Amino acid sequence: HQCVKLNDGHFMPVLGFGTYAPPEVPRSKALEVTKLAIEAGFRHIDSAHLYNNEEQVGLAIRSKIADGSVKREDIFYTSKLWSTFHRPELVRPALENSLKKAQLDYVDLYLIHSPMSLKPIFDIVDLCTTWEAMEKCKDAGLAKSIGVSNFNRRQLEMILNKPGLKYKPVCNQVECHPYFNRSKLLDFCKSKDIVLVAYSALGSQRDKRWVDPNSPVLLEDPVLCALAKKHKRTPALIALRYQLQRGVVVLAKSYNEQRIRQNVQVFEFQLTAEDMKAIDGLDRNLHYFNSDSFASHPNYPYSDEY
Numbered sequence: 484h485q486c487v488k489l490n491d492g493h494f495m496p497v498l499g500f501g502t503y504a505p506p507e508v509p510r511s512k513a514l515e516v517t518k519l520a521i522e523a524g525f526r527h528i529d530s531a532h533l534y535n536n537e538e539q540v541g542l543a544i545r546s547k548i549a550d551g552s553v554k555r556e557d558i559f560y561t562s563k564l565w566s567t568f569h570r571p572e573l574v575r576p577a578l579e580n581s582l583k584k585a586q587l588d589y590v591d592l593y594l595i596h597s598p599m600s601l602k603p604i605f606d607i608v609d610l611c612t613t614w615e616a617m618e619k620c621k622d623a624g625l626a627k628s629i630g631v632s633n634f635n636r637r638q639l640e641m642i643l644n645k646p647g648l649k650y651k652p653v654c655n656q657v658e659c660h661p662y663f664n665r666s667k668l669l670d671f672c673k674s675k676d677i678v679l680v681a682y683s684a685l686g687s688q689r690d691k692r693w694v695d696p697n698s699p700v701l702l703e704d705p706v707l708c709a710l711a712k713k714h715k716r717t718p719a720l721i722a723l724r725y726q727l728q729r730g731v732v733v734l735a736k737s738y739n740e741q742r743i744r745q746n747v748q749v750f751e752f753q754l755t756a757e758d759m760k761a762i763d764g765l766d767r768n769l770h771y772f773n774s775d776s777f778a779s780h781p782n783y784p785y786s787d788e789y
């Protein structure tokens with residue numbers, strides 16, 4: 484186990500369970516694998532309105548509460564505001580709908596899923612107004628903590644320098660792995676008392692809608708394989724452990740009972756400085772999400788990478 488204290492005083496488990504599966508996977512699987520993740524030791528569960536699974540995920544959590552395994556307060560459940568609901572008047576009802584789907588009274592964490600506003604086809608919205616609406620959700624107790632996702636440094640500073648800012652984002656959940664390690668952004672986050680949460684920490688699910696299949700497969704990397712042999716673990720476990728040692732909170736999606744249980748072994752071993760340096764050397768500006776649908780968005784996060 485372990486947690487990090489967020490800048491609002493609440494605590495977030497450093498390993499999280501990724502609940503996203505594509506639509507060819509039946510919705511009943513999300514129920515089954517979330518129970519298995521909880522049984523394995525996961526206490527941080529990551530969902531979203533977009534994932535069309537919140538009823539299954541909440542039910543998995545409610546059912547592990549009902550059978551005595553955990554208490555509500557032992558679970559860190561995250562959901563996310565989808566990009567068609569950035570207009571400030573849409574934020575609280577979107578959150579209320581997510582809680583009804585999950586049949587929960589509050590989320591531990593609510594995030595702005597993306598800065599790339601879409602029309603309720605792109606939209607123009609002052610994300611600072613979105614953020615104010617997020618702060619009122621926290622004041623109301625709908626969300627214990629509030630944060631952002633897919634923000635670059637500039638987008639984060641906009642929020643941080645907002646006149647009358649009441650609550651800082653507790654985190655920024657972003658694509659992060661050995662091929663796109665986000666070092667500078669991570670330093671910026673640490674400087675501001677903001678946690679970086681890694682998604683696609685295992686190389687993404689390589690969905691054809693968003694990911695070039697020609698792209699290298701992170702988990703076949705020769706340095707990750709060589710480190711997995713050295714420690715007698717697996718490339719996945721090397722990738723997750725790398726994140727914990729750099730101060731990143733790391734997600735891990737698996738819908739496989741074996742791999743779900745394996746991923747919690749991240750707490751059972753440690754990498755050396757030289758191992759960390761070798762993994763650092765893999766960085767190569769490779770974001771797996773790489774689509775026309777977003778590359779030309781006015782608020783695309785990766786156009787400040789230069």
Ligand SMILES: NC(=O)c1ccc[n+]([C@@H]2O[C@H](COP(=O)([O-])OP(=O)(O)OC[C@H]3O[C@@H](n4cnc5c(N)ncnc54)[C@H](OP(=O)(O)O)[C@@H]3O)[C@@H](O)[C@H]2O)c1
Pocket residue numbers: 500501502503504529530596632633656657681682683684685686687688702717719720734735736737738739742743745746
């Ligand atoms: N904020 C956003 O915009 C955003 C974007 C992407 C993802 N997310 C969140 O981040 C979560 C995780 O990222 P992701 O969905 O891209 O997947 P990921 O965590 O990078 O995992 C990718 C693939 O790795 C496999 N895997 C898991 N453990 C493994 C192991 N020990 N050994 C070999 N393979 C293993 C899984 O396949 P199997 O299922 O077959 O095990 C999975 O499909 C998502 O589920 C979602 O909660 C958020």
Ligand SMILES: CNC(=O)c1cccc(S(=O)(=O)N2CCc3ccccc3C2)c1
Pocket residue numbers: 503531533566596597599633772773774777778785
């Ligand atoms: C688990 N899948 C998701 O959370 C997800 C799926 C589709 C789209 C999005 S997103 O937040 O609009 N996404 C994330 C960031 C990104 C970066 C470059 C190009 C496209 C995108 C799109 C997230």
